[PDB]
From Swiss-Prot, chains A, B:
Protein name: Tyrosine--tRNA ligase
Catalytic activity from the UniProt record: tRNA(Tyr) + L-tyrosine + ATP = L-tyrosyl-tRNA(Tyr) + AMP + diphosphate + H(+)
Residues bound to ATP: S206
Native source species: Methanocaldococcus jannaschii (strain ATCC 43067 / DSM 2661 / JAL-1 / JCM 10045 / NBRC 100440) (Methanococcus jannaschii)
Record's subunit section: Homodimer.
Mutagenesis or variant effect for K287A: Decreases the rate of aminoacylation more than 200-fold, without effect on tyrosyl adenylate synthesis
């Protein structure tokens, strides 16, 4: 089922009923935007996977390589950001997604767009805009005006592109709630879960260096998985369990010596969850399985580059 | 000075006198070998730097891309090793090293070469060979015959290539002592220091994932440096200090707020060592300086792609 395929592994859909209505349409577009990242990690991959899920559902996909937004979010100069964006496009392409790749600054500085940003700036309170940026803005002891221009420019972007659907992590939630509230056409929002960092603290961001990159070496992957936070019986905030939930193909065979129970096949992540919670499967065996299967999945991607 | 340039930042030279005698030669070669690595780190860079030092001293440089040795050291199949080796050549070339690059298997399987390995297998005791491999061999509960073939094959390689100088990390010391005992011609051995891991525990290897890759994103570098072991007034086993010693140019300016002492200029690593031990320079400020300067240095390398 197309609905359940798209719903699978999302934190929320705003709204489920509106999504149904968009599925009855032949031509339908979905959008996502990315601040260019120095290294594309699993969070990105999780989202690109959802875009492919949407594509296989008949959606035309649009990727905003958000150079301006990165500029506004203190990620350095536009010219170096556009390079990183190009590298990000190449990493996406390797993941097996065909879409329209658009740099933000291609349409985000035109007279009328700018005018509409200011139109929305009249409609958005400073407090509302600052709240929408809590999980997106760079840490700054002295928040810049640029921080509050960011959300309105994304909302306008959403308007300009004209996507039936907008996709992002749960960090994007508040900006999307804004978009729905302020624009004539309400966009259907699909929000993906925020992966936990490898050491287990906070969440997994590109600036925290707590991630598995899609082109990391098999030795890195094994070392990162090996080092990672993964307490016995604990599913919540466990990044290894998350990688098992969001990336791995089931049925999954976990190779273990007979000394420690022997190999065990699991038909579903729920089964794995169950076995892990009641101490039936040790973290180190979970880790080795996840690490090897992750390599097998990330292998074609690492090769292309 | 040429000798002092070559000596700069080495753990040892075997021997200093023998190096001098090689310096009076017009034609002189220096070799180093590498087990192909999925990611090229600072440990590699430190050595390629030393190879450039020798290059500028009038040394024809030979790089052995040791595919066979990696095969013997359980790094997987030969065909995939050769690819990683190719990628390794690309990184070395980016470091601005022009030299002869050679896959081990190009000459390490010829009748006479093999015969000479066996001639040496007859001269080398199992205990001696196992000892030479303590810091090189992959961890194994059940050590393989391949482990002890490795060191004799490197010695024979050293002999075959005919290099005046052999260069490597301190892990290669014992195998080099062997080569000097067993071969008609004694090779001058230049051993580079082994860099500490970012968590401060054990040396930095490409399989412990405790390293900074030369092509890491500026944010990874910043997060890696940020998380790294670097205790107040502690120089020994401090990777950040080591990075400062082996990679940074002097005079060095360390940017700090006037609140914490203001910017300070150091004209030598020694001065830095002093300031750090005196606790006159804080870890965080050391880190921030080291990270920004490390980016500037690793920038053009990362650019070649
Ligand atoms: N805020 C997103 C980036 C992002 C940038 C731009 C856009 N859109 N959507 C329509 N037009 N531009 C969406 C997300 C982040 O945290 O990476
Ligand atoms: N044992 C070195 C690799 C290495 C391999 C081969 C060679 N040579 N030298 C001459 N002929 N082959 C040197 C080092 C490591 O631990 O990476």
């Amino acid at each position: 089922d197309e609905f359940e395929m798209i719903k699978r592994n999302t934190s929320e859909i705003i709204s489920e009923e509106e999504l149904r209505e968009v599925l009855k349409k032949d031509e339908k577009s979905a959008l996502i935007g990315f601040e260019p990242s120095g290294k594309i990690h699993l969070g990105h991959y999780l989202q690109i996977k959802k875009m492919i899920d949407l594509q296989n559902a008949g959606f035309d996909i649009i990727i905003i390589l958000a150079d301006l937004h990165a500029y506004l979010n203190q990620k350095g100069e536009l010219d170096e950001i556009r390079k990183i964006g190009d590298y990000n496009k190449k990493v996406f392409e390797a993941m097996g997604l065909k879409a329209k790749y658009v740099y933000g600054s291609e349409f985000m500085l035109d007279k009328d767009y700018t005018l509409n940003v200011y139109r929305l700036a009249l409609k958005t309170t400073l407090k509302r805009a600052r709240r929408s940026m809590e999980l997106i803005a760079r840490e700054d002891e002295n928040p810049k005006v640029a921080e509050v221009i960011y959300p309105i420019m994304q909302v306008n972007g959403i308007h300009y592109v004209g996507g039936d659907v907008a996709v992002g992590g749960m960090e994007q939630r508040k900006i999307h709630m804004l978009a729905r509230e302020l624009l004539p056409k309400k966009v259907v929002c699909i929000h993906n879960p925020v992966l936990t960092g490898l050491d287990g603290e906070g969440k997994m961001s590109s600036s925290k260096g707590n991630f598995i990159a899609v082109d990391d070496s098999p030795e890195e992957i094994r070392a990162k998985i090996k080092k990672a936070y993964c307490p016995a019986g604990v599913v919540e905030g466990n990044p290894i369990m998350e990688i098992a939930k969001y990336f791995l193909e089931y049925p999954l065979t976990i190779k273990r010596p007979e000394k420690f129970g022997g190999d065990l096949t699991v038909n579903s992540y729920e089964e794995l969850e169950s076995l892990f919670k009641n101490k039936e499967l040790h973290p180190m065996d979970l880790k080795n399985a996840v690490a090897e299967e992750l390599i097998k999945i990330l292998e074609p991607i690492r090769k292309r580059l």
